[PDB]
A and B are shown apart, each in its own frame.
With several copies, the nearest count.
Chain A
Amino acid sequence: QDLEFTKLPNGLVIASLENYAPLSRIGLFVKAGSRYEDSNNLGTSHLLRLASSLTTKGASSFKITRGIEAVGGKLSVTATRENMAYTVEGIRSDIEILMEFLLNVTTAPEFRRWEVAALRSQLKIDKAVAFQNSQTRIIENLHDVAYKNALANPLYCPDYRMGKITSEELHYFVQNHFTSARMALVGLGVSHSVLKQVAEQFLNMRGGLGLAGAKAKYRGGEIREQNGDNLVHAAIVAESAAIGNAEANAFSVLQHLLGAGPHIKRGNNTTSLLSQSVAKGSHQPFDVSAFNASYSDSGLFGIYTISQAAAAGEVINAAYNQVKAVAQGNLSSADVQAAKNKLKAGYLMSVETSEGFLSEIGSQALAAGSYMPPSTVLQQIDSVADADVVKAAKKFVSGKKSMAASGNLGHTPFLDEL
Chain B
Amino acid sequence: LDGFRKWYYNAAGFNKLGLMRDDTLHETEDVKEAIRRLPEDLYNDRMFRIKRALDLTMRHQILPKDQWTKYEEDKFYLEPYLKEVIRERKEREEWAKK
Q: A: which residues have CB within 8 A of B?
A: 60, 62-63, 66, 112-114
Contact = CB atoms under 8 A, between A and B. Distances in A.
B89 to A, nearest CB: 10
A163 to B, nearest CB: 13
A66 B39 contact: no
B91 A63 contact: yes
Interface string B30-68: 000000110100000000000000000000000000000
A113 B84 CA distance: 14
Given A62-B95, A66-B95, A114 B36 contact: yes
A112 B92 CA distance: 18
Nearest to B81: A114
A416 to B, nearest CB: 44
Contact of A113 (B39, B87, B88, B92): B39
A220 B57 CA distance: 69
Given A62-B91, A63-B95, 10 more contacts: A60-B87, A60-B88, A60-B91, A62-B88, A62-B92, A63-B91, A66-B95, A113-B37, A113-B39, A114-B37
A218 B92 CA distance: 52
Interface of B: 36-37, 39, 87-88, 91-92, 95
Contacts of A112: 37
Contacts of B87: 60
Main secondary structure on B side of the interface with A: helix
B82 to A, nearest CB: 13
B20 to A, nearest CB: 21
A113 B42 CA distance: 14
Nearest to A55: B88
A62 B87 CA distance: 11
Contacts of B95: 62-63, 66
Nearest to B39: A113
A62 B91 CA distance: 8
Contacts of A60: 87-88, 91
Contacts of A66: 95
Contacts of B92: 62
A66 B88 CA distance: 13
The residue among B39, B87, B88 with the most chain A CB atoms within 10 A of its own CB is B88
Which 3 residue pairs spanning A and B have beta carbons closest together? Answer: A114-B37, A62-B92, A62-B91
Nearest to A112: B37
Nearest to A61: B88
B54 to A, nearest CB: 27
Contacts of B88: 60, 62
